[PDB]
Curated annotation (Swiss-Prot):
Site entry (Transition state stabilizer), positions: S26, Q105
Main localization, broad class: secreted
EC number in record: 3.1.1.74
Regulation: Inhibited by n-undecyl phosphonate (C11Y4). Inhibited by paraoxon.
Name listed for the protein in its UniProt record: Cutinase 1
Main function: Catalyzes the hydrolysis of complex carboxylic polyesters found in the cell wall of plants. Degrades cutin, a macromolecule that forms the structure of the plant cuticle. Allows pathogenic fungi to penetrate through the cuticular barrier into the host plant during the initial stage of fungal infection.
Origin species: Fusarium vanettenii
Disulfide partners: C15-C93, C155-C162
Amino acid sequence: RTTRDDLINGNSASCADVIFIYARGSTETGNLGTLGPSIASNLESAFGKDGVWIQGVGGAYRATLGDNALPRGTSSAAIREMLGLFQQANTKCPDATLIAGGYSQGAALAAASIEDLDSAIRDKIAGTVLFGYTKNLQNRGRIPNYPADRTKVFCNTGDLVCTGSLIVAAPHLAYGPDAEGPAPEFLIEKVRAVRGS
């Protein structure tokens, strides 16, 4: 339902071409929350169920409300978890194109993980989508150390976490349509641009 561990469970003798690592919002269930499943069915339609591995960030990422107040908008243990998944993806499947995403605290987690990531693996991440990005104002709409053209931020008007606050208002809960339409289309386009055709 909201849990996919395709990378952890995948056999490196039969790597997928595309690996998607996604971090859920604060309090959400499984390791994909509300938005992850929608992005995953679209990517599966585009690449085939065997062409893409969907991996939510689980393990030490508890997606606690309190961790939003920590320096980079999430915990050091959660950043280590997501870094470990990018490292695992590169180790099992060095030829796979990576794509990433996150919602709310998961968007701050994706941004911090990519900032800290070895640049050689970071270059393999074709695109990242961020929804309700809690460090949008602070980071001026960017992921540190990652190019603007591979980044797509979805921040609604009235979503206060995009404007430097941590108050959750109704526009923060309105990213469902983006996750099923423009966000997977962006990711698919960026995969095709690095892979070519």
